[PDB]
Design a protein around this ligand. Sequence first.
Ligand SMILES: Nc1ncnc2c1ncn2[C@@H]1O[C@H](COP(=O)(O)OP(=O)(O)O)[C@@H](O)[C@H]1O
Ligand SMILES: Nc1ncnc2c1ncn2[C@@H]1O[C@H](COP(=O)(O)OP(=O)(O)O)[C@@H](O)[C@H]1O
Ligand SMILES: Nc1ncnc2c1ncn2[C@@H]1O[C@H](COP(=O)(O)OP(=O)(O)O)[C@@H](O)[C@H]1O
Ligand SMILES: [Mg+2]
Ligand SMILES: [Mg+2]
Ligand SMILES: [Mg+2]
Lengths: 393, 57, 366, 366, 366
Amino acid sequence: KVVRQSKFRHVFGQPVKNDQCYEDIRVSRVTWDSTFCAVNPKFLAVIVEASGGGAFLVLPLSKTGRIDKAYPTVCGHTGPVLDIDWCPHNDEVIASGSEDCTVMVWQIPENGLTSPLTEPVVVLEGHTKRVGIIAWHPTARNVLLSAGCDNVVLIWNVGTAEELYRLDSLHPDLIYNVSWNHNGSLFCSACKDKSVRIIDPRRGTLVAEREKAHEGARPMRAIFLADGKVFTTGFSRMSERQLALWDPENLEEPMALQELDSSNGALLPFYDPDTSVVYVCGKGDSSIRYFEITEEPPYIHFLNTFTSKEPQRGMGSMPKRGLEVSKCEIARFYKLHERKCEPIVMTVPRKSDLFQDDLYPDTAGPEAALEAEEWVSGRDADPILISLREAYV
Amino acid sequence: ASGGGAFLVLPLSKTGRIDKAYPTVCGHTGPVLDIDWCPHNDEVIASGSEDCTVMVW
Amino acid sequence: AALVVDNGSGMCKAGFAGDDAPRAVFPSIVGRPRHQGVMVKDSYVGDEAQSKRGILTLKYPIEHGIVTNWDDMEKIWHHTFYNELRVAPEEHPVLLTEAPLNPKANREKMTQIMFETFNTPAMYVAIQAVLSLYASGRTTGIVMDSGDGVTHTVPIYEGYALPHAILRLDLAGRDLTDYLMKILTERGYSFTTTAEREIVRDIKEKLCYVALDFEQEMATAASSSSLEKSYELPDGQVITIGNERFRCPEALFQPSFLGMESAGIHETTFNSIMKCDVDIRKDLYANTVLSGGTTMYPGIADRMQKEITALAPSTMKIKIIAPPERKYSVWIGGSILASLSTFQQMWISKQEYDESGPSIVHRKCF
Amino acid sequence: AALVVDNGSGMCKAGFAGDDAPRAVFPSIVGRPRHQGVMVKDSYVGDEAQSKRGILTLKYPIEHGIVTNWDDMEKIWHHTFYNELRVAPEEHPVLLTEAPLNPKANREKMTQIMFETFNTPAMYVAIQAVLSLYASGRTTGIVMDSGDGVTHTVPIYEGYALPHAILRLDLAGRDLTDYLMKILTERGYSFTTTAEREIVRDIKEKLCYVALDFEQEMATAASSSSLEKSYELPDGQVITIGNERFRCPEALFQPSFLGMESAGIHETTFNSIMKCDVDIRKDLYANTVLSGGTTMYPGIADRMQKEITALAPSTMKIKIIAPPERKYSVWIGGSILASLSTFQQMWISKQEYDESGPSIVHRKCF
Amino acid sequence: AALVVDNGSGMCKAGFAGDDAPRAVFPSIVGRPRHQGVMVKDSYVGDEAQSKRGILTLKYPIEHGIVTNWDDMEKIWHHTFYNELRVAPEEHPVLLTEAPLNPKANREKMTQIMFETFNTPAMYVAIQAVLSLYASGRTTGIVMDSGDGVTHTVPIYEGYALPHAILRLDLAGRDLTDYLMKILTERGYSFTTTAEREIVRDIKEKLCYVALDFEQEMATAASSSSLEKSYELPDGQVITIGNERFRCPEALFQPSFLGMESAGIHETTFNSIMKCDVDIRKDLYANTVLSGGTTMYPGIADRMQKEITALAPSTMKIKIIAPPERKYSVWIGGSILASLSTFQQMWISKQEYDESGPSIVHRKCF
Ligand SMILES: Nc1ncnc2c1ncn2[C@@H]1O[C@H](COP(=O)(O)OP(=O)(O)O)[C@@H](O)[C@H]1O
Ligand SMILES: Nc1ncnc2c1ncn2[C@@H]1O[C@H](COP(=O)(O)OP(=O)(O)O)[C@@H](O)[C@H]1O
Ligand SMILES: Nc1ncnc2c1ncn2[C@@H]1O[C@H](COP(=O)(O)OP(=O)(O)O)[C@@H](O)[C@H]1O
Ligand SMILES: [Mg+2]
Ligand SMILES: [Mg+2]
Ligand SMILES: [Mg+2]
């Protein structure tokens, strides 16, 4: 009764050793506020700076230590690369959007890159402006969402290189970020007009909209929760960073509204559906703040904060499948400095060395529940869940 | 002294901490070697330095 | 309602959170019989040991801030909860205090004791130095806690501590109590037993004072009877002491009186400030805080300010903060801390400790 | 109400167009705590960092005129607009300053942040050297810009710059501050931490000067105490320096003191004017304008004139222009230029950049 | 028969030219009684002070490579010539060693005392770092020199030194010894007196070592007793230390343990190399030489090599040179240098000094 009941109130962060990091990496210097990193349990992808066009460096996770400056990179875009995303159903497939108003999908070799990669598997040309938002469909196979600076949202079938849906008359200003819901039926978007929009892509209808969710003019984010709520991080009129919880059935007032600080930099949230814990990182910040979202009021409980002495340039989150379950690790974060990527281990302290069933509920597997054609018909299915008990050693 | 030579002359009542910027008797071009008060004059002191000069104050 | 417990080396203070003064203050003492019973309890704690000390041998469970006997220490806590606060330990969260730079193993021992032997629901540990600054309503300053077992000098700037600048002096009131016992023999009075030692402590707390100028006080005492004072023993014998009133507290500024070559208490504060950054020494000079029961000697603040001023540069403003309640700053500051709404986060539950152990205890230490 | 922002390696100057002096002048430093807080903001920028530098690790986002970390660089701009000027960046056009021979990539990053991060309506970026000549009210001359990061010599004739004759000398005030730090060790004074670096910089800005004859000054300092000066440290301690007052600025004319193979400023000026055409060297000789905070050493102009006169032909008239306000000459020229009626067409609109990109920024700028 | 005298902060080494090892090695301490003699020599220097340290107050005349008391320092030299070497200082030339970047005044006082007080016939002063390279038989390389007061890093290429690239670290054996006290108190062992400092130093020189992986060593030390060792106090008491064996030397690599803002010894060596020219960094990486008693910890060279390798480019071949006799490399190199035929011209005669002064000493020396 004295202490709010939780399992993650003492989760502490610990950076990996120096030899386990990745140095000598020229991280991209684009002012676009994206994750700048995409990591899957096999590979690590980071957007890098190229003199001509744009490229991102993809290296195996085992390839730690210093990286050769002449290491082959994925240089196919004619403009700087804005964002990258691994395919959830294929760890060897990654999509990239750049300033050249195109999206190109790549197939990485199993052993990594021996020669620079220029030709992609499939090129998507549907945007008139630079594309800085890409989001794979959580359930439907070969389905990709792209949102460029032209305030146009497109749905692509990479398997057939077909534009499934076009959403244009839905965003009056620039779009900040887009996140799918749990089953992939709905996606939420954050726009420059301080309006949070929930849109059905297969129907092209605005489900719910909340105007002036955050009164500040600074960029703000919005993500979907597993239970079906929306977490938005934004700014106040007094330029204070705030965290808000929203009910799609009632958006007249937020469920919670907490203010963190008056620092600048957009707050990138990282949601863990298994633990219902959102990690809030800000661009240029040296600290990571993680909160637990529960039904008990005020529905947003601050757990703790890992603090570093170095600002980060971007952030990549390791999904559950690649975590070290035996060490009671619930999250791994690849902090990106200006010339180094430092993995950070998020660890739940536990006395027992055995498998912790409570810490590790069934997680979505790498197999797609549906297909593009089936999802187009209107079929809805939850992601297939696997067991992490086998990963125990 | 950083350059030349000097000796500090302060009143007996001026006790306690003496500030670092207290004026000194800095006339010799070399460090002072010996000092002696005049027995017949409490306000007269002679000093000898490495400049091969004896200078009376 | 939480419990604030400060088990200092010689004085144990405890009370409910939010109260202005500790509910119970009793000596950190455990007594055992030293004579045979002849008429038709193996140990006593605090007052029940104090009132019976005539037939008991008194032992402090803690020396120099080091636990010497955990079982008696557990008995102290058991007496504390049930006989002093008279409440069930499992019904209240407890805020506990530790000495600066306390060994983690020592911090783990009491953590195990609280959750296992007392089944406390929630628990937290805070540094006694920080609690004193809470009582003074300050976030920047160097706090001087002089207890019964050991003396520390902890500098804090803007809520940030500097562990490298923390200095410890192995001298406290218990050593003074022995010194007063030593310097009372030449006047013709003999005290040897532990029960007699406690009597000396009462005389120390009542007639001792810090002289602004020790040698002049020596000269005044050797030529006049003005400084003379009389103390009545429990048997009604009246004891008269002269220069020993200020000779004993002089040991803090002159540890050589005990044969210790360590510098004076005033110098220890100066060195602690000197060990910190140049730019923050100005705030520390004007924010010197006195804490602990040893700092109740009259005139100690004036002697403190005079001594450090002779050491600090003349351009520095020296301010010595000696609140009248500073005998209980550690407990009072804890009462303030436990009353804060933001304090509820760093509580540690029994379930969390049972599943994680010592790691969550050493972490979360602000 | 156009904003004039002059961002340097160590100093940042900001204000409003038409004013005669920058409104905001704060150090370009970012500090982070190096300790753990004990009383229940992860970064400090500008004066607040200077006020709390004791517990912070000071870092310069700009090093040798190069942005070593843009994340802290944005903090400097954010601190300027909201914490120093207390204005909305989206409501005022902003005039920016670039170092001579600025890389296009550096300008693009500066341009992109201004239009995207802060959404400024209109902005323009001008050469710092050109702005300095505006304050002097001259159309022809060679300006040496020695600030905190690097020293530049840019000759300008009749409004035309000569990029091929522009010379760069990687030696500025920060290197002097380091040189003053290392030479202060021989006198027994130790300064190692970043907090001490600012203290040394303050001494340099207050007691250092340029001697007309270095050798004669050395003889004078070795035989007299008239050159001694006393500085008071923030902790109240006082230090005295002798020959180091003029030894530290001597590195400007003798870079070999730092082990640098490059030649001094006086020669670097001479090579730059020797590099341009013969018919314009006459005007540049009599139009040498000094700019930057590192040019505030007393007597630097006299030593400047003597040195170049020895290199320049005897028939040649050498005039060194050292306005007393040349520390803010870059800002003053920017305010003057932004107040001109004919400057309104150099502005670049946010909409124009959104549709054209940084290509329009490389053009219309030199 | 020239005399080789190597005077350090804590250790003083003396002997004769051509000898393989110093004849006299004694602590550089001056002890004075702190009690009152009651049974019917006011100072002790060196080994006799150590033997009687129980009743003496031990003071180091040199602190951080700075002579804090020249009067006690002359006692060291007087004890060296007459008590240790038992030779006449006026009959043998003396070769002296000085710290890198030695202040001019410090050499002058050393120069003055040899010629005027001890009346030595001939004298010469050499850089300690250079003499270490002499012992290694190398003409090119960077030598790191960590002794009792100060750690230095001096790169030398083909007999040419680079003073601008010389880096100084205020962290040496004495600092580690004091750190050992602070963490030993956490184990319940109280060492406060100056006499115990030599005891703590003795434990450090016998049981401390450098762990290749610091965090891994903690995990092993926290789960096993294999890293446990026992030391016997002079009074027969046996103390036991665990992780403190390798925690104390870690401060050399992690100065934050002592609260120091400076970087570790490996980065300082790396930074010193980086300050040099690009073309000479090839040889410096493969010619890193360790010298001083602070480099005697087991495994320090391997931990050195691993740390610098992570900083240097992968193409760089790193060689760490740690000769077994490097504790006396400064003295041994001096013995070889003094024995060279081409060295007799370096000598400075007393008659020449009398007629010329210390000016001849600043020249002919580096
Ligand atoms: N009024 C007083 N005058 C002088 N000494 C006192 C006074 N009150 C208490 N003391 C002494 O101060 C010592 C330490 O008190 P305290 O700081 O409460 O101990 P701790 O905090 O270590 O439990 C006690 O041993 C006591 O003898
Ligand atoms: N009075 C002074 N005397 C000597 N040097 C100064 C003085 N004032 C400022 N400086 C130096 O000028 C440098 C910065 O000058 P300035 O060019 O105005 O800013 P920035 O170089 O950052 O653009 C600082 O590093 C400082 O050391
Ligand atoms: N075997 C050893 N292990 C660890 N430290 C040692 C050892 N031998 C000597 N030292 C340390 O070396 C320091 C002095 O070394 P040295 O350079 O020979 O003397 P100095 O510093 O006076 O020149 C001493 O403080 C001592 O603690
Ligand atoms: Mg106490
Ligand atoms: Mg400038
Ligand atoms: Mg040495």
